[PDB]
Amino acid sequence: MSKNYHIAVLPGDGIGPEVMAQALKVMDAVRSRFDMRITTSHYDVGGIAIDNHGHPLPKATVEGCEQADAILFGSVGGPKWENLPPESQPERGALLPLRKHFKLFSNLRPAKLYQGLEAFCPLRADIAANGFDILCVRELTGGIYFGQPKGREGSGQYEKAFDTEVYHRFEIERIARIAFESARKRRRKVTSIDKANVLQSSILWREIVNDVAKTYPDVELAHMYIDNATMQLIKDPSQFDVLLCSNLFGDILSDECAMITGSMGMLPSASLNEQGFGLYEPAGGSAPDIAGKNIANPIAQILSLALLLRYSLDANDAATAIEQAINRALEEGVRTGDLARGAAAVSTDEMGDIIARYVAEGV
Amino acid sequence: MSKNYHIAVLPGDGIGPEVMAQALKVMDAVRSRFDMRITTSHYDVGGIAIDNHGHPLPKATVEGCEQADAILFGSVGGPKWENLPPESQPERGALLPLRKHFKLFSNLRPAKLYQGLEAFCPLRADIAANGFDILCVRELTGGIYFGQPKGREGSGQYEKAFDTEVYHRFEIERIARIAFESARKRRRKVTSIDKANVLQSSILWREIVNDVAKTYPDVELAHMYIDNATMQLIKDPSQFDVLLCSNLFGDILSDECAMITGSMGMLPSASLNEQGFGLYEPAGGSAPDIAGKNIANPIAQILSLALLLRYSLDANDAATAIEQAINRALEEGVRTGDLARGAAAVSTDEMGDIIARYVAEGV
């Protein structure tokens, strides 16, 4: 008994279409198992949109997303457009405007080292064997990415350009809550990242996070400078549970968290507004190197469909089945090339066929 | 040459006087072997200045530095002064005003994995085995840490605090030239780090660095976004030669570079103004926990003397002789207790003995 949900599917560039095809395989297994009514439409975004429409975010694409319950997004960008004005580049001219337009203030990126994939972790084996499991909560619609004033002025030696790391109380209140709520579902520890020794905006950030913390006396709260956090994710990632970050600090540390897993092809991303509409994608980029070679790990994309089902379509049931289907395959020792490091790997397609199959197979 | 160089020596707190003694011991070996006239005057700074003068940056100290060709600086801080207001504590009250007073716009932090010390690198062994050797150049007196406007205003949920990432053409050019000139003496590669897909200040930064590059056509220039650079330093640090960074981005990445060596006791730091006057110090802090115990690694301080000789006293030969002596000591299995245990390590004053003699014996 379903509502006939709708998903705008934006595959994008590079490995985007390849891994998206696998997620739609899985989505079809979810439809015809959980008897959900799911309707989709495909739209161009990024470099493909630039190719067909001259713009990375077509109005028709934004309108398609508007008409949907959530956006399942691949990846955008590539060397074929890494030559355009920033305002005209696929990565920024699409993503930043989608975030602002749909008010997706909340970015959730879970990064854990999967047991038995320690070999691929780029950290020392003893650090890797200790393990880590982190959720990076990034503020997505404010701070320096969007702050005003922002521009360039003058000429000569005093020509200048400027951006403004500005936060309002409400912006820190709402992202801080997401962090603490997420912590309750995990290991009840939040580490808020700022630069409060110098930044006025960090001093307010720290203050408002301390105020929210009073609602969560069961959660251990720590504050840590961005420059220390960058070191500690290398030195001892096991110390973090939930990372709470600004837009810019989160951009840096969330990608650092992805790198230290050694398995970015398994990492999903959710960007959420207050109404529960979201944009769900792999944590990695379009990977033009292997694009079109049926090599790419579809797991990040499929896991982001799971987040979509859980957070946007009130279907934790289908979300958890998908995650289950992915652990079984990995239990069995199924690997794409990135986690076989080449030898004995399955293709994007078979990995996607297998996961879709295990979902519909119930177990 | 002219001779009669003068250095202001500011040992500071904790391990600072300890490791400074060994830098001064090596400096006498440099005096003899290179027939250099280097006179010193010592001054209180940090905790010891608070003890003796009531505040961390006495005027006699600043004047003594003004009267010198360079500043050889130890480290400052410790638990004895942690009960003071933050702004009154040794490092905040001393290091920042000195940089500002002396317009020390450039920060150079060399980070290499020494042969023999790979075991301490926190990256996976086969990554550590590849090695790396990086100089991070960090704009030190500008950007968001000092930019205006900066403040906090308003009330309720729309109360806001803000900092401004602002750079002028003159700031960008002078720090870019330092990086190009440094790369010319290394492996002729500058990677300028920015966020030009999003920031207006980064767009100007990238534009001006491209102009400056035209003056150094014998040095390769690449650009990389800050969030990629954080990942790449973990994935493959061997790819970098010279990093050219804003204050914020260089702050973060020089600490990450320091972390990936796994041995901070080896790491020196130079902070230079446009006249070649500089403050030279270890990358690491005052290590109160081992202070006075004659175990602190003096190699950071000694290599910061080597940088003082190279950048302020026109004494590259002397600098290179100190560096060679350290390579020699390491090759003979000589280690301090941060690099080995028990009888496989030597004390601070024995390491200094060994380094000074290898310099004296070099010629």
Ligand SMILES: [Mn+2]
């Ligand atoms: Mn990013």
Ligand SMILES: [Mn+2]
């Ligand atoms: Mn720092």
